[PDB]
């Protein structure tokens, strides 16, 4: 029988290129615009990815839509944090192979203030020496990290699936030879990182919601992102979000 983590591994999305011409000079506006277009393409691939996660298609269609709309930024920032920790350490954001935000790009007006929250993610994965298997389990768990205030249509089934991937994370932790005390603290550390994704995302969504709503900024979002932001803005203003936590 194929392991649950090996099924999460085969469905890992392909590498996307930004289509960024490096011969033309940089600007904050140019980088932000290119990142929005890349994000939209990443979110179309995330839908294909989510549908192949064992259990996800069994949830009501409305729940599938809900989970993807709440977690979009969490999934993207986490995947970016992972690429950035594997490809080139330490203070580099590896959005695409043709779009790495280096120290020279970080000096661009207000580039650092939006990048620092994402740099924290790669920094944490590096400090905790997160494995590929732990990462895969953690990423699926981020898709299941927020639910509506009054829960899902398939709430009981969701709770079963979420418990399954928590247990799957536990099995990946155990694979690193250590005693019960250090396994307990690893699970504690990793789930604390999962919890902190809510705060990392909060900062990214503020820039997101502002740039989307202020049309005088001429910051374009592709259809996929524009549709998610339009859906999400009222949900944040009406308190319609239950951020699931492992601690506190």
């Amino acid at each position: 029988t194929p392991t649950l983590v090996s099924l999460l591994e085969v469905i890992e999305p392909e590498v996307l290129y930004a289509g960024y011409d490096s011969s033309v000079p940089d600007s904050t506006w140019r980088i932000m615009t290119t990142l929005n277009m890349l994000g939209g393409r990443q979110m179309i691939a995330a839908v294909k990815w989510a549908k192949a996660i064992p259990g996800f298609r069994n949830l009501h269609l409305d729940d599938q839509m809900t989970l993807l709309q709440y977690s979009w930024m969490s999934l993207m920032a986490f995947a970016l944090g992972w690429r950035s920790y594997r490809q080139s350490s330490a203070n580099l954001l590896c959005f695409a192979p043709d779009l790495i935000i280096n120290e020279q790009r970080m000096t661009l007006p207000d580039m650092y203030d939006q990048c620092k929250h994402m740099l924290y993610v790669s920094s944490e994965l590096h400090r905790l020496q997160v494995s590929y298997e732990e990462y895969l389990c953690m990423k699926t768990l981020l898709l299941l990290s927020s639910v509506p205030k009054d829960g899902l249509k398939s709430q009981e089934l969701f709770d079963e699936i979420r418990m399954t991937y928590i247990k799957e994370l536990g099995k990946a932790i155990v694979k690193r030879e250590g005693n019960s005390s250090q396994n307990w603290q690893r699970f504690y550390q990793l789930t604390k990182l999962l919890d902190s994704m809510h705060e990392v995302v909060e900062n990214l969504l503020n820039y997101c919601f502002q740039t989307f709503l202020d049309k005088t900024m001429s910051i374009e979002f592709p259809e996929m992102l524009a549709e998610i932001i339009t859906n999400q803005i009222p949900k944040y203003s009406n308190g319609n979000i239950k951020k699931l936590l492992f601690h506190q």
Partner: peptide, 13 residues
Amino acid sequence: ENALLRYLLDKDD
């Protein structure tokens, strides 16, 4: 409402 996401989930693949 949310036409593109619904399409991507409902379509084959």
